[PDB]
C-alpha cells in the first residue's frame, strides 16, 4: 500500500490551514486530497444577517492579501443593483489602490513561493515595500490592511493633502526592488530546476477546470478582465498583459513579475490623471452626507440617521459581478429582495477552483514539486473557505 | 495588447555557445546572486529600535475606544444608539434613562473589545463625536476579562487620551 | 545614506548598479507630517434650484427584468451572444521580455 501523510494544517508550507492528505509511493505523489474548511467561518449566513454597509468589512477578511480589491468587487455589485454611478475621482482612487493592492499581493505570492522553495532573502527585501504600502493604506483609512475604504458609494474619505507625493516617491523606486528580486531568482539554475516544467496544465484543461487569471495566462490564454470587461476607469489606462507559453510554474512566476511592472505603469498613469471633485455619489439616500451638513440641515440629519440605523434599500434582483482580482476572477452573486439586507450573497474565489485542480497538476511529481505547485496557485484560505 | 515573457531563442554561434559553456562550467549567475547578497550586506538595515523608536502613524489611525466630553465636562453621548445599531460585530451594549436633572444619558455603555473589529463605524455614525477610536494600540492584557470595557473604563480612556484625541480630530475633521 | 565612498563603490560593484540613486530608506523627500487644512469641493447636486430629486433618482429607475419567451404565454439567421472578440495586438512598447 501507499504511505498516507498529513501535510498541514500545522506545516510551514501549508499556506495557513490546509489538511493535504497525500498518498505517496516513496516520495512520488500518487494522490492529493485537500481537506479544507479549517477556516470556514460561515461568512455568507452572517452577511445574510447584516445590512449592505455592515457586510462590507467581511470582504476585507475574505482575501486578506488583497483587501481593497474585494471591497471594489462588492461595491460594484451593490452599485449595479442600486442603479447608481460613483464619481470619477472615486473611480480613479479605486483603480490606483487596486493596483497598489495587486503589488502587495504579488509581492506576498512570489516571496512566499520562493520561501517555500528555499529562498528566504527576497521575502525580507520585499516586505519593507509591503510595509510602506501598508502605511499608504493607513494614511488613507486609519488601518494597515482592513481599510473598509471602498464602499458602494465610492470611497469613505478623500485623500490627505500629501499622499500622492509619497505614492510617487515609492513608485519611482519600486522597479529597482523588482530588478533585485529578478536578479536573485530569474536566471538562477536552481530556481529554474525547481520551477521549469513543474505543474504543467494545458489551455483546454485550464478552461474546463474553472481556472482564471495567471493560471490561464501561463498556458497562453489571452484573457484579462481589465481589458475585455473593464469596470471603473480601466478603459482609460494603458498596460500590457503578460502571456506564458509553457504552462508551468516558471512561466507563471515570470507573468507575476511582469504584472508587477505593469501595475507600476498603471499607478504612474493614475497618479498623473487624478481629477478633482467629490469622492462619493451626491445622493444622500445612498451615501451619507458630510458631518457639517448633518449638524446643520434637517434632511441631512434624517438621512444620516436612517442610513446608519436601517440602511439604504436595494431594489430586488440578482447580479453576478466579477473583477480581475490579483489571484484571478473574484465574483459575487448578490440577490436582493427589496429590503436593506441582502437575501443571498455567494462569493466566488479563484483559489477554490485552483485548489480543486491540485490533484490534476501533481500527477507524476514529488513532494517538493507539490510544495512548489501549492505556491504557484497563489492560495489564501480565507477566500477558499469563506 | 499583450507581451510574451518566455519566448526568446539563444544564439548558436561559437561565441555565444562558448559563453554559455563558461556560464555552465564556471557558475556565473550564481556568482551574480552572491554579489547581490554581498551588496545588501553593506547597506544600512531598515530596523527601528522599538520601543525607543516607534512606527509612523496618521491622525486617522483607529485604536482603543474612548468616550469624550464637552469643554464644560458634560458628556457628549446622548444615548441615541446609532453606534449600537451600526456596529457590524454587535460589540456595543447600551442602556439609558432620564438622569436626575432630566438629561438623556446612558446607564450602560459596554464595548466587547474581543468582539470588535476596529472598523470605526461607530465614530462615523455618532452625531456628537462622543465615541472615538483613539490613537493607543499598546493595551494588551493578561486576562480575557480586562478587555470587556464598561462605561467607567471608556470615560477614563477619554479623560486619559483627550489631549491627543482632540488634536487628531482637529487635523482630520475637514475631511469628514 | 551615511556610508563612506569606498563602501558605496563596493555596494555598486557588488550589485552592478548605482544604489545611492534609489535608496530603500526614505530620508527627507516625503511629505511633512503637518499639512494645511483642505477645502474639499461639494458635488453636482448642491444646486439651489432646478434640483428636484425625482430627476436624479437612480434607484427609482430600476425595473423588473424584461421577459423574453415565457412558456406559459423564414429568414431566421443564427445569432451569437455578442460579436466575436477581436484578436489582441502585440505590445508596440515591448513585445518580448
Amino acid at each position: 500500500s501507499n504511505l498516507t501523510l498529513n501535510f498541514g494544517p500545522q506545516h510551514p508550507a501549508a499556506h495557513g490551514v490546509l489538511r493535504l492528505v497525500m498518498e505517496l509511493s516513496g516520495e512520488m505523489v500518487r494522490k492529493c486530497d485537500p481537506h479544507i474548511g479549517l477556516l470556514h467561518r460561515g461568512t455568507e449566513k452572517l452577511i445574510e444577517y447584516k445590512t449592505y454597509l455592515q457586510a462590507l468589512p467581511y470582504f476585507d477578511r475574505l482575501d486578506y492579501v488583497s483587501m481593497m480589491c474585494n471591497e471594489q468587487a462588492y461595491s460594484l455589485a451593490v452599485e449595479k443593483l442600486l442603479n447608481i454611478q460613483p464619481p470619477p475621482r472615486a473611480q480613479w482612487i479605486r483603480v490606483l489602490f487596486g493596483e497598489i493592492t495587486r503589488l502587495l499581493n504579488h509581492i506576498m505570492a512570489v516571496t512566499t513561493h520562493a520561501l517555500d522553495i528555499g529562498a528566504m532573502t527576497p521575502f525580507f527585501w520585499m516586505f519593507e515595500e509591503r510595509e510602506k504600502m501598508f502605511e499608504f493604506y493607513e494614511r488613507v483609512s486609519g488601518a494597515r490592511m482592513h481599510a473598509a475604504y471602498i464602499r458602494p458609494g465610492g470611497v469613505h474619505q478623500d485623500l490627505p493633502l500629501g499622499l500622492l507625493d509619497d505614492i510617487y516617491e515609492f513608485s519611482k523606486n519600486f522597479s529597482f526592488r523588482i530588478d533585485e528580486l529578478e536578479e536573485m531568482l530569474t536566471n538562477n539554475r536552481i530556481w529554474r530546476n525547481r520551477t521549469v516544467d513543474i505543474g504543467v496544465v494545458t489551455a483546454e484543461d485550464a478552461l474546463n477546470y474553472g481556472f482564471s487569471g495567471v493560471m490561464l495566462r501561463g498556458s497562453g490564454i489571452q484573457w484579462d478582465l481589465r481589458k475585455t470587461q473593464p469596470y471603473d476607469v480601466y478603459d482609460q489606462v494603458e498596460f500590457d498583459v503578460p502571456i506564458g507559453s509553457r504552462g508551468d510554474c516558471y512561466d507563471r512566476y515570470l507573468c507575476r513579475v511582469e504584472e508587477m511592472r505593469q501595475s507600476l505603469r498603471i499607478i504612474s498613469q493614475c497618479l498623473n490623471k487624478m481629477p478633482p471633485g467629490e469622492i462619493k455619489v451626491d445622493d444622500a439616500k445612498v451615501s451619507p452626507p458630510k458631518r457639517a451638513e448633518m449638524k446643520t440641515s434637517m434632511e441631512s440629519l434624517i438621512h444620516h440617521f436612517k442610513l446608519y440605523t436601517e440602511g439604504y434599500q436595494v431594489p430586488p434582483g440578482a447580479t453576478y459581478t466579477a473583477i480581475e482580482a490579483p489571484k484571478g476572477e473574484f465574483g459575487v452573486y448578490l440577490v436582493s429582495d427589496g429590503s436593506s439586507r441582502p437575501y443571498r450573497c455567494k462569493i466566488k474565489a479563484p483559489g477554490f477552483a485552483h485548489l480543486a485542480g491540485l490533484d490534476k497538476m501533481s500527477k507524476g511529481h514529488m513532494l517538493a514539486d507539490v510544495v512548489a505547485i501549492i505556491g504557484t496557485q497563489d492560495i489564501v484560505f480565507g477566500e477558499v473557505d469563506r | 495588447t499583450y507581451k510574451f515573457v518566455n519566448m526568446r531563442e539563444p544564439s548558436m554561434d561559437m561565441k555565444s555557445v562558448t559563453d554559455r559553456a563558461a556560464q555552465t562550467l564556471l557558475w556565473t549567475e550564481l556568482v551574480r546572486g552572491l554579489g547581490m547578497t554581498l551588496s545588501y550586506l553593506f547597506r544600512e538595515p531598515a530596523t527601528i529600535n522599538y520601543p525607543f523608536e516607534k512606527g509612523p502613524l496618521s491622525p486617522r489611525f483607529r485604536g482603543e475606544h474612548a468616550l469624550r466630553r464637552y469643554p464644560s465636562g458634560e458628556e457628549r453621548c446622548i444615548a441615541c444608539k446609532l453606534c449600537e445599531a451600526v456596529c457590524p460585530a454587535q460589540a456595543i451594549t447600551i442602556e439609558a434613562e432620564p438622569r436626575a436633572d432630566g438629561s438623556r444619558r446612558t446607564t450602560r455603555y459596554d464595548i466587547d473589545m474581543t468582539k470588535c473589529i476596529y472598523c470605526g463605524f461607530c465614530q462615523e455614525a455618532c452625531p456628537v463625536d462622543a465615541i472615538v477610536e483613539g490613537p493607543n494600540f499598546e493595551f494588551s492584557t493578561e486576562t480575557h476579562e480586562e478587555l470587556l470595557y464598561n462605561k467607567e473604563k471608556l470615560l477614563n480612556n477619554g479623560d486619559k487620551w483627550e489631549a491627543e484625541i482632540a488634536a487628531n480630530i482637529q487635523a482630520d475633521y475637514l475631511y469628514r | 545614506a551615511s556610508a563612506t565612498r569606498v563602501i558605496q563603490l563596493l555596494r555598486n560593484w557588488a550589485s552592478g548598479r548605482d544604489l545611492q540613486a534609489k535608496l530603500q530608506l526614505r530620508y527627507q523627500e516625503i511629505s511633512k507630517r503637518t499639512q494645511p487644512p483642505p477645502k474639499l469641493p461639494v458635488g453636482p447636486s448642491h444646486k439651489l434650484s432646478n434640483n428636484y430629486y425625482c430627476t436624479r433618482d437612480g434607484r427609482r429607475e430600476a425595473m423588473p427584468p424584461s421577459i423574453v419567451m415565457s412558456s406559459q404565454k423564414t429568414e431566421k439567421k443564427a445569432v451569437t451572444p455578442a460579436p466575436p472578440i477581436k484578436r489582441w495586438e502585440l505590445s508596440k512598447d515591448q513585445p518580448y521580455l
Partner: peptide, 29 residues
C-alpha cells in the same frame, strides 16, 4: 470661501517612472 484645495498632482505632472526590467550584462567573454 477660499479656493478649493484638494490633493492633486503638481502643475504639469510627475516625473517619469521606470518599470522595465534592467539586468546589465556585466561580464567577461
Amino acid at each position: 470661501a477660499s479656493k478649493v484645495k484638494q490633493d492633486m498632482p503638481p502643475p504639469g505632472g510627475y516625473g517619469p517612472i521606470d518599470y522595465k526590467r534592467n539586468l546589465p550584462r556585466r561580464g567577461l567573454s
